[PDB]
Structure formats: structure tokens, C-alpha cells
């Protein structure tokens, strides 16, 4: 019945400027602490600030003073952070939480992706084999989603598809591989980025000297 | 820039008790940095579980207490459960904020130790024509999570030129995949002749090494 | 007030 619910966030450019909601319901929103936290890919959890049910005390780690600005109003029953001057390293998941004791409640976060990057296809790199493991680099594409699969769906048991990494690029790049009973059929990655409109399938055989 | 320090990775099992640390770089925890204990498990989903030092978030299990053994804070767990197995971050206050240490990942044993399955990419022909070199290394199937992928290019240490991936957990079998991919322009690449990866995981007596020779098969 | 998580 407590909700904390998020909105807002999504992709901004270096230098940008983005503000994040933070909607409560099912307690009495104007007696409680409430706080913005945030877990960036490969960090661990970072306690941004707080502020208190009056809004008298605003209190932030002093490395995050200059770029994130917390207040609160409290006839929305809504919190607000306030994203200022992002940098790339402001890349995380934000939440916000309710003190209770301790961090007691909890929004469903906010993704937020700071890059300068403009839309881009990947390039599709063979991984050849030498169970044998091969695959596909998926390298340097914006903005995240792209499909891979194998021989057009047919393969799937032994596909491991890993989760993009954001580089200091901006572009994302991922991999794909497959374990097989050391044959060889032909082995073929399909990769679909839709924004785009990038459509390639590499065929994955072993090297010739 | 106060540092809050935990174990990297600690291994319980199911109905055993095991307690988990939290140091200040600042010197003695004390009761004015407010210990908080919050749990993360898969999906980002987090819980508070402990506040001030001692206190239970309320509906927290009291298998879970606080407690402040020497100079440092601590969680104990009574009785670990399978749903334990998480990340765990405490957070002291300073005065006029929190800084969360680093987590600690408690691995609740599902099952075997699983070592993984150690295999090397070196880049393609196709991608040094694009300028760029990739050099992938593959850690297959294996539990628990916690292991350690170092990159030796010509035997000298690498550091902040490669970034790691993780699957999910496998559902039916416990274990996890994992990729680490050495990044390096064409022109860095070419520098240099032995790629080695190496890899450190439970499973292993010793730290398995894969590596190639630049430009040989 | 719900007691916060400092104090």
C-alpha cells in the first residue's frame, strides 16, 4: 500500500539539466525524512541527500553539492532531485527513500544516461571459436537496445547475451557467446538495433591462419 | 573523504549465523555515525534493515541485528535463509551525511563450488580494420559469484582498460557467466605480444591464466 | 515524526 512512485529521468547530454519526481502514497508524506540514493553500473550504492519533513534541512554528501538539488512539496505529497550540470559519471539508477528507523520505503528507481552521443549501429565482430565457446562483439552503438540471436532463433540452449556496458564514449558495446559440442555447423549471430535501422548477421568460424 | 570499508564477499549457508563488518577511515565507529545496514538483492531491490546502529526498520526479521564489536559496526544474520543471499551496504554518518562502504556480497551456498570454464578472444582481423582491439575473456558457468579477471599485456598489470559484464543468476543450475573485455586502440594493441588473462574463483586451486601470442595461431 | 535514520 506504500508507494513511492518515480518518474522522469531518461537520457541527457553532459552539461545537461534533468529533474526527477518522486510521488508518495499511503503514509503521511509531511512527517517524514526523505532521501535520493543512487546506484551507478559498476559502484556501489551512493547516498546523495536528505531533507526534512519542513524542508529547513537539506543535507548532501559534499561531492554532490554543485550538481543535485533536493526539495520537496509536501501538499503534492512529492520529492524532487533537481540534476544539475550532469557530468558522465552521473550515469545510475536514482532512487528515493523514506526514513523510517532506516531506509525504510523504496521507489522503483529512475535510469538515468548522461552521453553526448547521437544514434549509431553497431559493429558486429566474429568471436571465433578456439565444448567449444565462440560468439559475436557487439561494439560502439547509442541508444541501448539491440536484439542478438542465433541462427535467426533456432540456437539458443548454451547463449549467453551479456548486459551492455556504457563506455567513456558514450556508445554502448556487449557481447554474445555460445558454447557447441566442438563441430565444425555454421554459426550466425543476428544483431537488430532498431534506432538505427541496423540490420547484420555475421557468420562465426574459426580463424584461418 | 571518508572511506567506509566491508568485506568484499562473504560465504554462509542456510540456518548458519555469520556477521558482516563496517569500518570508518575516520577511526572508531561510534553512535553518532548512525549505522544503517540496506540489503540489495537482484533486480536493484533494496531494504533497510537496520537504522542507528541497532534498530530494526520495522517488519525487518529479527534474525537480523546490529551490534558495534571493537571500532567497527556489524550485521549479524541468525539463521541465514536462501532469500539472504545479497549485497550488503552500511552507511555511517558524518555529522551532516551518509557514506555507504563499499557492500559486501554474501553468498548463501545453493550449491557445489563450480569453477568456471576459462576461454580467450583475441580481436579480429575485421575489427583492427575499424582502428580498435578487443580482447574478450570468457568465465563460463560458474558459482559462487565473487571472482577476479586480471588482464597481463607482456606480463605488466592492466588497470582501467577493461570492463566486466555478469549474467543473471542461472535458474535451474546457480551459476553465472561473465565476460571481461580489454579495449585498446589498434595502434596500442599492436605494442605489444602476449594477451593473458587471469582468473581467480573458489573453484580453482591455483589462478587459471589463457592467453595468446599477437599475430600467431 | 518518523524517527529518522540519524540522529
Redesign the interface.
Same mark, same amino acid.
Given at each position: 500500500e506504500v508507494k513511492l512512485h518515480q518518474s522522469g529521468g531518461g537520457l541527457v547530454q553532459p552539461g545537461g539539466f534533468l529533474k526527477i519526481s518522486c510521488v508518495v502514497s499511503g503514509?503521511d508524506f509531511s /512527517? *517524514?525524512?526523505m532521501?535520493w540514493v543512487r /546506484?551507478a553500473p559498476?559502484k556501489? @550504492?551512493?547516498?546523495i541527500?536528505?531533507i526534512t519533513?519542513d524542508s529547513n534541512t537539506i543535507?548532501? !554528501? $559534499?561531492s554532490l553539492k554543485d550538481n543535485f538539488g533536493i526539495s520537496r512539496d509536501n501538499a503534492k505529497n512529492t520529492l524532487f532531485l533537481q540534476m544539475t550540470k550532469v557530468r558522465s559519471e552521473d550515469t545510475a539508477?536514482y532512487?528515493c527513500? %523514506? *526514513?523510517?528507523?532506516?531506509?525504510?520505503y523504496?521507489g522503483q528507481?529512475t535510469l538515468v544516461t548522461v552521453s553526448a552521443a547521437s544514434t549509431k549501429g553497431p %559493429?558486429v565482430? $566474429? @568471436?571465433?571459436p578456439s565444448?567449444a565457446?565462440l560468439?559475436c562483439?557487439v561494439?560502439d552503438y547509442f541508444p541501448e537496445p539491440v536484439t542478438v540471436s542465433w541462427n535467426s532463433g533456432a540456437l539458443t540452449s548454451g547463449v549467453?547475451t551479456?548486459?551492455? !556496458?556504457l563506455?567513456s564514449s558514450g556508445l554502448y558495446?556487449? %557481447?554474445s !557467446?555460445v558454447?557447441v559440442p566442438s563441430s565444425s555447423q555454421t554459426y550466425i549471430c543476428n544483431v537488430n538495433h532498431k534506432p538505427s535501422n541496423t540490420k547484420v548477421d555475421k557468420k562465426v568460424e574459426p580463424?584461418s591462419? | 573523504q571518508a572511506v567506509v570499508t566491508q568485506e568484499s564477499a562473504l560465504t554462509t549457508s542456510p540456518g548458519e549465523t555469520v556477521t558482516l563488518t563496517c569500518r570508518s577511515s575516520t577511526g572508531a565507529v561510534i553512535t553518532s555515525n548512525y549505522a544503517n545496514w540496506v540489503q540489495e538483492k537482484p533486480d536493484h531491490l533494496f531494504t533497510g534493515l537496520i537504522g542507528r546502529t541497532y534498530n530494526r526498520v520495522p517488519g525487518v526479521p529479527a534474525r537480523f541485528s546490529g551490534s558495534l564489536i571493537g571500532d567497527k559496526a556489524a550485521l549479524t544474520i541468525t539463521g541465514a535463509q536462501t532469500e539472504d543471499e545479497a549485497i550488503y551496504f552500511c552507511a555511517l554518518w558524518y555529522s551532516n551525511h551518509f557514506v555507504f562502504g563499499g557492500g559486501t556480497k554474501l553468498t548463501v551456498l545453493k550449491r557445489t563450488v563450480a569453477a568456471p570454464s576459462v576461454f580467450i578472444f583475441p580481436p579480429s582481423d575485421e575489427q583492427l580494420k575499424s582502428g580498435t582491439a578487443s580482447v574478450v575473456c570468457l568465465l563460463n558457468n560458474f558459482y559462487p559469484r565473487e571472482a577476479k579477471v586480471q588482464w597481463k599485456v607482456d606480463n605488466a598489470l592492466q588497470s582501467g582498460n577493461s570492463q566486466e559484464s555478469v549474467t543473471e543468476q542461472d535458474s535451474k543450475d546457480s551459476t553465472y557467466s561473465l565476460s571481461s573485455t580489454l579495449t585498446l586502440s589498434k595502434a596500442d594493441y599492436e605494442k605489444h605480444k602476449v594477451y593473458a588473462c587471469e582468473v581467480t574463483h573458489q573453484g580453482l586451486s591455483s589462478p587459471v591464466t589463457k592467453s595468446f601470442n599477437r599475430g600467431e595461431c | 515524526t518518523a524517527p529518522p535514520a540519524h540522529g
Open positions: 503514509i /512527517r *517524514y525524512w532521501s /546506484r559498476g556501489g @550504492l551512493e547516498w541527500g536528505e519533513p543535507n548532501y !554528501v $559534499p539508477l532512487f527513500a %523514506s *526514513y523510517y528507523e532506516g531506509f525504510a523504496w528507481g %559493429s565482430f $566474429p @568471436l571465433a565444448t565457446a560468439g562483439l561494439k549467453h551479456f548486459p551492455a !556496458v563506455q558495446s556487449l %557481447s !557467446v558454447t580463424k591462419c | - | -
